[PDB]
Every structure is written in C-alpha cells, then in structure tokens.
Amino acid sequence: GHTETIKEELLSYFSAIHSFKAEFVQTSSANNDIQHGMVFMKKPGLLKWDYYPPTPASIIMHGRTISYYDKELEEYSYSIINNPIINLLSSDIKDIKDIIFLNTSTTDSKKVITIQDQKTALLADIIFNTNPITIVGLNIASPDSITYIKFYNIQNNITIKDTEFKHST
Numbered sequence: 001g002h003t004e005t006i007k008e009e010l011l012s013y014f015s016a017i018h019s020f021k022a023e024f025v026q027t028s029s030a031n032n033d034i035q036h037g038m039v040f041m042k043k044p045g046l047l048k049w050d051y052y053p054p055t056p057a058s059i060i061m062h063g064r065t066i067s068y069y070d071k072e073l074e075e076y077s078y079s080i081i082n083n084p085i086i087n088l089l090s091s092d093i094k095d096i097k098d099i100i101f102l103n104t105s106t107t108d109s110k111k112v113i114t115i116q117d118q119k120t121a122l123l124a125d126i127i128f129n130t131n132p133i134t135i136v137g138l139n140i141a142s143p144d145s146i147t148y149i150k151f152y153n154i155q156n157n158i159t160i161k162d163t164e165f166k167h168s169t
C-alpha cells in the first residue's frame with residue numbers, strides 16, 4: 001500500500017537477516033530448464049552461488065562486480081555489472097538507492113514485498129516466512145521473462161567467514 005510503510009517492513013525483515021546459507025532451486029518461464037545449487041549471503045554486501053554439475057560454477061557478487069569461476073574449464077572472469085536486484089539480498093536496506101517499493105501482500109502466514117529497480121525497470125517479489133523471519137523466495141519479472149528462485153534448508157544468522165567469499169589460483 002503506502003510506500004514508506006512498505007520500506008519500514010522490508011528494512012525490518014532484512015535487519016532480522018544478518019546472513020544465511022541455503023540451497024536454491026531456480027527456473028524460468030523462458031524454458032523448461034531447472035537449476036540447483038547452494039547460496040551464501042553475508043549482509044555487508046557479500047553474495048555467493050554454487051551452481052551444480054549440470055552447469056558447474058561458482059559466482060561471487062558484490063555491488064557492480066561479478067567473479068565467475070567455471071570449475072569445468074577452471075577459468076576465472078572478473079566483470080563489472082550493475083545487477084541492483086539480486087544483490088539486494090545482501091544489502092542494508094537503509095543504504096539502498098534507486099528503488100521503488102510498490103506493494104506488500106500478506107496471506108497464509110507469509111509475507112510478499114514488491115519492488116522495482118528504477119534503472120532496469122525489473123520487478124522483484126520477495127517472499128518471507130513470517131515466523132521465523134526467513135527469506136524463502138525471490139522472483140524477478142520483466143515483460144519478456146520471469147525467473148523464480150526458491151530457497152530451502154535455510155540457516156539464518158549463521159557464521160560464515162569472509163574467506164568463504166573468495167577463490168584464487
């Protein structure tokens with residue numbers, strides 16, 4: 001409904017989450033392809049994705065930087081990106097800029113928050129469990145495709161060393 005109340009709710013739920021390690025399942029309407037992996041998140045900006053043998057890879061995301069390690073070809077790739085949406089998972093909501101908070105739907109002991117990125121015009125739906133506060137889903141929608149991510153076997157506020165979000169030759 002009202003935008004600033006939605007901002008309050010989102011920042012509360014995200015403050016609750018200081019980090020998480022979970023398994024993820026990702027799919028898209030573009031195809032019938034499914035993807036599985038692990039995801040690590042440490043709130044001061046650090047995100048990491050381990051994609052499983054069908055597409056074996058390790059991605060580390062922080063702000064504008066993607067670090068991609070292909071484990072098959074054992075190849076590294078450091079690239080500058082924007083991706084304001086996914087990295088929102090690892091974000092202090094107080095600091096986040098260039099975002100519109102559209103809606104907040106509550107139903108079935110489950111909380112959904114809708115936002116849009118001003119630049120990319122990409123929509124994001126964030127799905128939390130009310131009790132305990134956990135991020136269980138994230139969908140990203142555009143006029144052409146929609147992507148679904150579902151997290152399971154979640155571990156909120158668990159210890160993860162900053163050395164985890166790092167690999168090198």
Ligand SMILES: [Cl-]
Nearest residue numbers: 105106107108
């Ligand atoms: Cl409702």
